[PDB]
Design a protein around this ligand. Structure first.
Ligand SMILES: C[n+]1cn([C@@H]2O[C@H](COP(=O)(O)OP(=O)(O)OP(=O)(O)OC[C@H]3O[C@@H](n4cnc5c(=O)[nH]c(N)nc54)[C@H](O)[C@@H]3O)[C@@H](O)[C@H]2O)c2nc(N)[nH]c(=O)c21
Ligand SMILES: Nc1ncnc2c1ncn2[C@@H]1O[C@H](CSCC[C@H](N)C(=O)O)[C@@H](O)[C@H]1O
Length: 252
């Protein structure tokens, strides 16, 4: 593929995040786990338990095969359901709750976000972290004002002007080479997210852009760099990576 560097970067960034907030023996709840793309990362992190939840059953089964056919020291649990707009009660709490490239889907409606934020807080141990990587609304609107909304790797389209300005847009179309196709993405209303979480005991402890986060980490972990094979992305690839940001809330 022609997006390998972009996959390496994203996985790199995610691995570093996991390394930063997880510790040995931790219990992790992976929301929007997908096809278990982080099982290996967690295996290196030496975590003890892994629970993955995804709305799509086609991905869960893929995450099962992977878990089933891999050298892992942690117990896995998969469940296919809606963890954002449908009540969720798994029974136990977790030290770390991860939602990689998937939490923005919780912003479907006002109620959805609320349910989703409630589902996160009730499955998080006090002191526990909720790490995520979501698209940056600020970034996107700027590329919009610059007219540069795409390239050979991706494409984004906002909604129509009928009685609406930029700040009034709630969603957009995202297309990615060898990935989603005109997938409907919901903008992450940051302020509403913060307030909503703060109301449930979760505080904002980290918000950084993918590129900076990437550059900063790539310098502190040169080994994980060459290990995951990476270094110096083309500006064309940077645009795709630059769309996402890192956000972390902790249950004080
Ligand atoms: N979905 C996935 N990615 C990313 O693409 C990779 C696919 O490879 P993969 O899942 O096969 O990873 P491994 O080889 O197992 O990694 P491993 O070698 O175990 O480390 C994932 O791992 C995600 O990083 C996405 N990136 C963006 N921007 N947007 C998306 O919607 C998206
Ligand atoms: N309400 C919901 N509950 C759980 N997963 C959801 C969801 N809405 C969307 N998703 C999931 O969001 C995921 C986004 S992509 C998942 C990628 C994965 N975290 C990685 O790092 O590769 C998809 O697998 C999709 O099925």
């Amino acid at each position: 593929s022609k997006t390998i560097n972009i996959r390496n970067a994203n996985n790199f960034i995610k691995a570093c995040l996991i390394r930063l907030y997880t510790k040995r023996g931790d219990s992790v709840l992976d929301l929007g786990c997908g096809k278990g793309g982080d099982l290996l990362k967690y295996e290196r992190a030496g975590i003890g338990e892994y629970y993955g939840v995804d709305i799509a059953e086609v991905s869960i089964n893929d995450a099962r095969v992977r878990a089933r056919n891999m050298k892992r020291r942690f117990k896995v649990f998969f469940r296919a359901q809606d963890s954002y707009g449908r009540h969720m009660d798994l029974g136990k709490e977790f030290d770390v709750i991860s939602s990689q490239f998937s939490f923005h889907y919780a912003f479907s409606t006002s109620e959805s976000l609320d349910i989703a934020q409630r589902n996160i807080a009730r499955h998080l141990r006090p002191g526990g972290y909720f790490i995520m990587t979501v698209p940056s609304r600020d970034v996107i609107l700027e590329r919009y004002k610059q007219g540069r909304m795409s390239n050979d790797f991706y494409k984004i389209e906002l909604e129509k002007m009928e009685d609406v300005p930029m700040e009034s847009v709630r969603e957009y179309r995202f297309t990615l080479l060898d990935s989603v196709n005109n997938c409907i993405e919901y903008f992450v209303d940051f302020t509403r997210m913060v307030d909503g979480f703060k109301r449930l005991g979760l505080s904002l402890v980290e918000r950084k852009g993918f590129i900076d986060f990437y550059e900063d980490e790539g310098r502190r972990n040169p080994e994980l760099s060459k290990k995951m094979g990476l270094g110096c992305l083309t500006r064309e690839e940077s645009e795709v990576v630059g769309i996402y940001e890192v956000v972390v809330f902790r249950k004080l």
